[PDB]
Design a protein around this ligand. Sequence first.
Ligand SMILES: CC(C)(C)Cc1cc(-c2onc([C@@H](CCC(=O)O)CC(=O)Nc3ccc(Cl)cc3Cl)c2C2CC2)no1
Lengths: 14, 227
Amino acid sequence: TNMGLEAIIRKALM
Amino acid sequence: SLTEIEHLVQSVCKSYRETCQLRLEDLLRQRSNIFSREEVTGYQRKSMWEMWERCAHHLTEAIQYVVEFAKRLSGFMELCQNDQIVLLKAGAMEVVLVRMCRAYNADNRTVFFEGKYGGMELFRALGCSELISSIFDFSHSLSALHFSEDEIALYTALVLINAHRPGLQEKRKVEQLQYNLELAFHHHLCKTHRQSILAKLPPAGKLASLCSQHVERLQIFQHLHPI
Ligand SMILES: CC(C)(C)Cc1cc(-c2onc([C@@H](CCC(=O)O)CC(=O)Nc3ccc(Cl)cc3Cl)c2C2CC2)no1
């Protein structure tokens, strides 16, 4: 897991 | 039954083509357009920060195209938000490493970077020669297997749609989507007599993890550096 990718991925799903 | 599998193949390949970032013919045609020794020296003269910023911007962009890829895969938007995130978190960077091999020229050992092709030496300012060399060897190994577009499209779908990812809520919903993709890919590989290519793939996990670590490191320390 990685928070930095989590952030990028959360943004892109919206 | 065959026509549905062939329809799913074409569906995954369509989803891939629309989200590929660059067309393959564009990357292949631009192979002649190569950075001069001067343009190489320009990149080598940049700050470690400025060169990592650019590369992290391209990694981030690349991960956003994989999210667009996943969004267009049938059944993926039906999944709950948690599962979508768990799959993309665990899969996205390895789909980027795999997508990168298209922009690698095995003839001269050069990669497409910001409008022209250059070698490992284009990245001296990252101070990460071992990491650079490994991503080059990886791209070289996939290039040498001549992965078609269809193969990349189906394989990268299976990197993403994996029911073994710790933290999934609807495991059974993911297995149904994974199995359908395995059927489809299996039929494609049999038709093409390419059954054996997945035995010959170099491992990608460690490299993807490092690339994710470096991207995070630059998000964490942005305030220690200029905008
Ligand atoms: C510094 C690292 C470790 C190579 C990470 C990295 C990749 C990118 C990086 O730049 N352009 C790219 C894209 C083009 C993006 C655009 O302009 O739309 C081309 C590519 O695939 N290059 C490529 C293919 C194979 C290798 Cl071995 C190296 C490269 Cl640079 C990338 C990849 C993230 C997608 N930037 O930083």
